[PDB]
Structure formats: structure tokens, C-alpha cells
Amino acid sequence: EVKLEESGGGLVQPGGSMKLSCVASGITFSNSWMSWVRQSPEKGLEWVAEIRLKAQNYATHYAASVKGRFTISRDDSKSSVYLQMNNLRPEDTGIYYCTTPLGGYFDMDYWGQGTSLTVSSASTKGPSVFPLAPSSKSTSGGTAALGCLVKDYFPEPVTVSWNSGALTSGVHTFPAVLQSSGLYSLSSVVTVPSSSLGTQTYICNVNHKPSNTKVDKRVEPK
Amino acid sequence: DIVLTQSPASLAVSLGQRATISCRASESVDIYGISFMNWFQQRPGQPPKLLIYAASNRGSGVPARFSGSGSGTDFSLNIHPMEEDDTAMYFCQQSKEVPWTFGGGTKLEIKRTVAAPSVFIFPPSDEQLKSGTASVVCLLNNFYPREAKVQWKVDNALQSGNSQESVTEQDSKDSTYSLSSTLTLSKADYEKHKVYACEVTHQGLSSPVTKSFNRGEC
């Protein structure tokens, strides 16, 4: 079975360097053109770099966005291709995939699961968690919404549960947005019976693995 | 570079009907009667999966409801009849010459009947205000289709540039979306004004809905 496996992603500051590695198994690697392709937080695909075969004098190609900052190389003896990335920029953030062959005529291809890179000047920081309190003005229909605003954390991701996982129906935890400050923010909301607002306790449980922090926030009528 | 114009960016199709995704190349991708256009499916968290190679050839094990056609500069991926696990991103990609280039992508979703949003507005918390910033949140819950106009007004002044929207993925059970719009102001700018309003226009509403509050009013 053919498999490609990427590694080496992580956090880095602008101007810094990282090296990605991709190991291939189950394929005659020395006969395969290898490329790196990245995917933006926006979820679009962008080819980065390619390296060809010894018979083609190991010809390399680079996207103009990365020329002079990235270097692709291979070690056929270890069935591996590498991407050395220097002078990194915020816009290099994304999931990086190793793939073959990408170009020419092929009836099958292979892609790794990818490795994540985040380029930012921000320091790791757990979120501030603020209540989105159910309104004191009545609803026409007897359902109330409330939530937690999970603000100013870095890097992604956070996870949010409600009442330690007992409350899951009606929960919407939004994708994060990167703010102009370089920190992320999202809200998690839930719809509940407005008649439970004086009886039922609501607590959002916000975990941020990168900072190894957990914050619980009780959300009450103001 | 060979630039690929993929259309539409967002496509909603009824289960059982045909989804057609198109790609126009800025120059021909043909060499000797072969058209070097590939199509990929991508599910969340997973790498791209080759569906169609060389314009019209189904990949091994790819279900028969996927097909590709085209030559020169004009190509389509057709999915018929659409099934629920076909909701995904799709991308065309030219393999004629380096640099290898991709279309901008199409997000294929399930079309369902119109559903109006329920709208809620949340003032900033007292805790956040003392920190020097104010976030005002407008929530649109469980609506379809995704298109909605959400307009912030502060003492009747139409806001622009100081809000961000976020949308959930389509719900697995009811096929609706929810959306947040968050208005960010300085504590100082927030305390300058009295009335905060979010106006929502959506096909499910016979009349756009305004939710509003007076700053500091319980």
C-alpha cells in the first residue's frame, strides 16, 4: 500500500525557518516526481514546489510566491522529499501536503494527510471568555439564545462544550476569525427554553490545548 | 501561468439531481488530443481525492455518478444523482505544464427549502467593557439559504469595516446554517452611542428584521 507522511509543521515567527519532511512507503520513490501543495486557512489549494528525477537532473520548480525562500530536495535512498522554508511570512500559514505526481498524465495519485504551519508574531495565549447573556426582553416564541464569546487566543484551536458535555442539542460553535491583532476569536451559542433560564445552570467549558488551559464560564441573565 | 476560473464558488443542489461544476482555463490544456484537466474532491480535514483525470476518465473506484467532460479551455465535472456524502469542496487542476495550477474551488451543499433565521442581539459583557473593548454580537440561527445581509447601525449610522461574520457548516440533520456578526468597538466609542441595532435581510423574512438595544438597559 502506498502512503505519504508529512511532518515538521508548527508555530514560527515571521522571518523564521522550518523544514518539512515527507516519507513515502510502498512506492518506487526514485521514479516519482514529488510536489508540495499548501491549503490556506481559506481552504484553497496552491502548488508550492516540485522536484523531478535523477534522469532529469533533479530539476526543481517553485511558485513565484516562494522562490528564493523555499528549497525542495529529495533523498531517494530514504524515499523522502523535504521543503526547507526560510524567511517565513504570515501568508505562508496553511496545511502543507506532499503529493505525487500532480503533473502530466496519471490515473492515480497519492497525497499525505498534511502538516500544519502557522506563521505569526503572536505569542501563545489562552482565551478570555465572556458571557453572551440571554436577553431580558421576551421572545415571541419561548426559545432563548445564550453563549460564550471566546476571545483573543493564539494559536488555533479551541474546543467548547456546554455543561461538561451534557448539553449538545442546539449548540453552534462558530469557526474562528483571525482578528487584526493577530489573535483569534469565536462565539459558541446554544438555544434553550426561556422557561429554564431561572432554573437551569449554563456553563461553557473552553479548552485551549496550545496553552494547556481550561476556562469555565457561567452564563446568567444580566 | 494557466489561470483556472472555477464556477460557481458555492453550489446548492437537491439530492437526486445533477450538480455541474465548471472550470475555464486561460489557455488550452490540450496536448495531442489529451486534455490535462483533473478534478479533486476534498472533505473537511482530509486531503484532496482524485475523481477525474485527463478531463473525462473516472479514477479507479470512483462512483459512476461522477463524470467529467471538456477540452481546450472549458471543462465540467458532473455529479448525478447527487448523494448526501457528495457535500464537499471540489477543485479543478491543470496538469499540462508547471506551474501546476488549481481552480478556486466549489463548495457543494444540499439545497433545501427556505428557512428564516431567528435573530438575537447580545450587548458586550460588563467584564469585557472594563478590559477596554466592546464586542456586540448579532446571531442568525438555523436559516436557509446562506445568503443574508447583516447591517450594523449605531445611533442610525451604518457601520462598515468594524464587523466580522462567521458561518457554521451546513447542519447534518436540517441542512440549515447559523451566522454570527460581531461588531468590535473601543470601550470609548461604545460609550459614545446609545442605540445598537442589527438589521437582517433574508429570503425567509417578508420584512427585514431589526434587533436593537439601548446601551446599559438590562
Numbering used by the authors:
A (entry chain H): 1 to 52, 52A, 52B, 52C, 53 to 82, 82A, 82B, 82C, ...
B (entry chain L): 1 to 27, 27A, 27B, 27C, 27D, 28 to 214
Article sentences:
Soluble native-like Env trimers have emerged as a promising platform for HIV-1 vaccine design. The N terminus of heptad repeat 1 (HR1N, residues 547 to 569) was identified as a major cause of Env metastability, leading to the design of cleaved, HR1-redesigned trimers or UFO trimers with removal of the cleavage site between gp120 and gp41 (19). First, we identified tier 2 mouse NAbs that were elicited by a 60-meric I3-01 NP presenting 20 HR1-redesigned BG505 trimers.
A potent NAb, M4H2K1, was identified by pairing representative heavy and light chains obtained from the next-generation sequencing (NGS) analysis of Env-specific splenic B cells. Here, we combined nsEM and X-ray crystallography to elucidate the mechanism by which M4H2K1, one of the most potent murine NAbs identified to date, interacts with HIV-1 Env. We then applied X-ray crystallography to further understand the molecular interactions of M4H2K1 with BG505 Env. In this structure, HCDR3 (10 aa) is sandwiched between HCDR1 and KCDR2, while KCDR3 (9 aa) fits between KCDR1 and HCDR2.
